[PDB]
Amino acid sequence: SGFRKMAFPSGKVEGCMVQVTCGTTTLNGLWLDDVVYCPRHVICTSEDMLNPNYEDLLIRKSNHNFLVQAGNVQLRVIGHSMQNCVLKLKVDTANPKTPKYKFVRIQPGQTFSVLACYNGSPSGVYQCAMRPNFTIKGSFLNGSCGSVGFNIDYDCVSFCYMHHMELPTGVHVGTDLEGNFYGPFVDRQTAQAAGTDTTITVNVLAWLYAAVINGDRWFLNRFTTTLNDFNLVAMKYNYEPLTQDHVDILGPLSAQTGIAVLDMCASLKELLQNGMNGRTILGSALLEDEFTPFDVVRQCS
Amino acid sequence: SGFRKMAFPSGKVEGCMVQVTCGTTTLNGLWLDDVVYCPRHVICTSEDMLNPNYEDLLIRKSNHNFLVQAGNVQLRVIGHSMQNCVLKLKVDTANPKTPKYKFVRIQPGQTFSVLACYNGSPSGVYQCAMRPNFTIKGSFLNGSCGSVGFNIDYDCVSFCYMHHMELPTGVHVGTDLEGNFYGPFVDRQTAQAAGTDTTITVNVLAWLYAAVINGDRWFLNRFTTTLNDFNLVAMKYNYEPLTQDHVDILGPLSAQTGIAVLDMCASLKELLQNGMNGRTILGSALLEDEFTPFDVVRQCSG
Ligand SMILES: *C(=N)[C@H](C[C@@H]1CCNC1=O)NC(=O)[C@@H]1[C@@H]2[C@H](CN1C(=O)[C@@H](NC(=O)C(F)(F)F)C(C)(C)C)C2(C)C
Ligand SMILES: *C(=N)[C@H](C[C@@H]1CCNC1=O)NC(=O)[C@@H]1[C@@H]2[C@H](CN1C(=O)[C@@H](NC(=O)C(F)(F)F)C(C)(C)C)C2(C)C
């Protein structure tokens, strides 16, 4: 029993972290085979960040302007190219700790583990949901850029995120491992806003199932709902509409507890219309939307 | 910015996790140098667990009755011994992935990272606080026994916890790496209760500093209080009394924010007296006590 926000073990990702310096800007790089991946803004001075022309900045940099360090050993850069908002530095040595890996683009609502790093040294590990407005609610300080988000399938590391900036609201933004930003963001020090955020409905349902598995039953009843009626109500509370694909993804949790998905939808509709009446669910006073059905299945089975 | 429940990177501990099997019971072991540490109930059947006489069960086991597997590498058990609730299995090979380490016994209020394992394989990492009643609010399924808790100081792993059992309330209990239970529990399948729990006051104050650092200032007021006046209110709401040692540990956060500890105590006193009125702090509708002053400084400065 118990239900906790849990990250994947970070070991295979720790063996890939390196320190990348260019002039007086130092950030983290991801060393996979003989290529180190990092945010391209490592080539910027504090001034350049206001309105950079990255092509003009990169032209002024030679391979010897990049100082890459793996622990205490310097890795010689023998080639360099820019792919969207990431820099790829070809190095003279292939990382012997390179695990099996793939680069993936995650979808809104999906979760990943973040290995927060400083000067190429892993510092912490936590779990994030990619918000519907393409922001994450992380914990990042100066020098944390180049820190990566990932998931693990048995022995394969799927890299889905690299950290680049923090928005005015305090939320965080970054790219996939091909340098393409998630969301309408640019790597420039200018005021940028994210869209209005919405609650991940399928994730709240997954969390209501984790609660029933753990013994919380006060919010259950024999009422039901059509998918359309639930959607008409949920969208008044800024919740995303539930689709058949979402219902299908909740199937294994529904089977495990014996509670039909549309019955849990009726309980959620009631929780939104009535509030929690001074009660808690899994020791929480708010409904939680940062656990996917997969996160609940992995912890409750 | 940001304040998240953060675990230590687990790689150093992942390299020490092994599968230990004795008969039909299988759980996790911690492989450091030529020794494997694991809960002693690995020598029990399900029936034995109801009322075990560990000494009579241990006497029936030989070195070859313990199957230890590191990945696919089978290790050879060349010695065995019981120390309190832990079994030590001497093996014929020193773990080359053994990090620099030490075994500590943590105090109530302190936090640690848990690497949850099943069949000797790491599954997930999370952060727990040792409650004042010596329980932890973890997440553990069958076969998780042997999973360990720890902290990391630069390159040295301080192992402080080994997982053994779950209480009827759904909370978790276990031992230090010497086999000594944290709390008044025994490794036997019989109804056992923990003491009444209390709120870790110093951790609530640390988390209030984390909130101000992050922009949350609505709860700040222009009042101050004394240590004694705060403690009269604390005892009424089942909060631990604040000591000078705890005030001294809040010093760095106090210096970073420019808010005196007794100015933050006045905000806490008002949150307890008036309640939170449905408002949130750091995205929480309830006061959080599972972050130490050390977890806050580590995350909000460096
Ligand atoms: C990477 N090392 C940092 C991570 C930041 C530092 C504070 N917390 C974080 O997550 N990245 C940056 O400093 C980037 C970098 C220039 C400025 N910047 C920002 O994150 C700024 N944000 C923005 O300009 C905004 F709002 F658009 F996201 C900052 C105000 C410093 C937080 C460049 C090249 C974008
Ligand atoms: C070790 N792999 C499990 C971990 C348990 C499984 C469910 N959640 C956990 O943390 N430990 C056990 O199975 C131990 C073990 C026998 C029974 N047991 C228990 O945890 C039971 N609890 C108790 O007996 C109690 F209340 F006293 F703590 C159980 C009811 C199965 C949860 C022994 C030898 C204590």
Author numbering:
A (entry chain B): 1 to 301
B (entry chain A): 1 to 302
Quoted from the paper:
Severe acute respiratory syndrome coronavirus 2 (SARS-CoV-2) encodes a main protease (Mpro, nsp5, 3CLpro) that is essential for virus replication. The essential function in coronavirus replication, together with the absence of closely related homologs in humans, identifies Mpro as an attractive antiviral drug target. The SARS-CoV-2 Mpro inhibitor, nirmatrelvir, was found and developed as the oral COVID-19 treatment Paxlovid (nirmatrelvir/ritonavir).
Single mutations T304I, T21I, L50F, and T135I had minimum impact on nirmatrelvir Ki values, while the S144A and A173V mutations led to 46- or 16-fold increases in Ki over WT enzyme, respectively. Crystal structures of A173V and the A173V+T304I double-mutant Mpro with nirmatrelvir did not display any major binding conformation differences. The ITC experiment showed that the binding potency loss in the A173V mutant compared to WT is due to an entropic effect, while the binding potency loss in the S144A mutation is primarily due to changes in the enthalpic contribution to binding.
